[PDB]
Amino acid sequence: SMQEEDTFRELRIFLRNVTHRLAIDKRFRVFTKPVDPDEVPDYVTVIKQPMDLSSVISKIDLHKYLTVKDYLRDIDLICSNALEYNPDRDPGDRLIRHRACALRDTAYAIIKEELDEDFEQLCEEIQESR
């Protein structure tokens, strides 16, 4: 229905806003674009499902997220990829993992404060009906 389409549009608007707020945070710069294979040639062989905040915006605009849960799976993937690709005690690895964790915790904290649970439940019930 039109009302359901309005619901998913409202979802996309919310997701774009959250994603922008993550993308402008200096700590999360490393997560804002896909890894450049020229810079990091073994990346795509170790990490099977790359994800970044630019790709997240593209996916919002492609209507790939019909729930906040779906979105958070991609935020989680950004974080888990960083953890897997940079697992060493070295400070470069530790910094990125700390930032990856902060990206994830920040997204979740925003959503906890700003997403109405009934709005999410509505999205989920529309998605389930399709």
Swiss-Prot record:
Coiled-coil annotated spans: 108-130
Domain named Bromo: residues: 3-114
Cysteines paired by S-S bonds: none
Tissue: Highly expressed in estrogen receptor positive breast tumors and in osteosarcoma tumors.
Localisation per UniProt entry: Nucleus
Induction line: Up-regulated in breast, uterus, colon, ovary, and stomach tumors. Induced in breast cancer cells overexpressing NCOA3 or treated with estrogen. Down-regulated in 5-fluorouracil-resistant derivatives of the colon cancer cell line HCT 116.
Functional note: May be a transcriptional coactivator of the nuclear receptor ESR1 required to induce the expression of a subset of estradiol target genes, such as CCND1, MYC and E2F1. May play a role in the recruitment or occupancy of CREBBP at some ESR1 target gene promoters. May be required for histone hyperacetylation. Involved in the estrogen-induced cell proliferation and cell cycle progression of breast cancer cells.
Entry similarity comment: Belongs to the AAA ATPase family.
Quaternary state and interactors: Interacts with ESR1 and NCOA3 and these interactions are enhanced by estradiol. Interacts with acetylated lysine residues on histone H1.4, H2A, H2B and H3 (in vitro).
Protein name in UniProt: ATPase family AAA domain-containing protein 2
Organism taxonomic ancestry: Eukaryota, Metazoa, Chordata, Craniata, Vertebrata
Coverage span on the entire protein: 981 to 1108 of 1390
